[PDB]
């Protein structure tokens, strides 16, 4: 049971490494789907072996959305 699903995506603008029990691992360029823009700071997304793991929004940029439309 889970309410609230989004298809947002973000790309890592810099290499990062999870140094805690609650963190996501990715390199510059990577992409994370299902981004839940939280009101606080850390967001929720999935990445490879990792799933719905907190990650620094300052190390990623939103890529999902209309570019030309």
């Amino acid at each position: 049971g889970s309410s609230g699903s989004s298809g947002r995506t973000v790309k890592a603008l810099y290499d990062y490494k999870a140094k805690r029990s609650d963190e996501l691992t990715f390199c510059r360029g990577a992409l994370i789907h299902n981004v839940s823009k939280e009101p606080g700071g850390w967001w929720k997304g999935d990445y490879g072996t990792r799933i719905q793991q907190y990650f620094p929004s300052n190390y990623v940029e939103d890529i999902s959305g209309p570019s030309s439309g």
Side-chain angles (χ1 to χ4, degrees), residues 10-34:
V10 306
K11 171 203 276 88
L13 317 164
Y14 320 97
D15 59 76
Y16 191 92
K17 170 84 172 271
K19 193 151 190 67
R20 197 150 151 182
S21 187
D22 301 271
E23 210 90 285
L24 177 67
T25 325
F26 52 97
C27 47
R28 151 66 210 204
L31 326 164
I32 307 88
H33 310 307
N34 311 64

Side-chain angles (χ1 to χ4, degrees), residues 1-6 36 52:
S2 300
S3 70
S5 172
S6 291
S36 278
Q52 300 287 264

Side-chain angles (χ1 to χ4, degrees), residues 21-24 43-46 50-55:
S21 187
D22 301 271
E23 210 90 285
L24 177 67
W43 291 348
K44 209 87 89 81
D46 51 64
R50 312 299 174 182
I51 313 292
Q52 300 287 264
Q53 281 313 277
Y54 291 117
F55 63 95

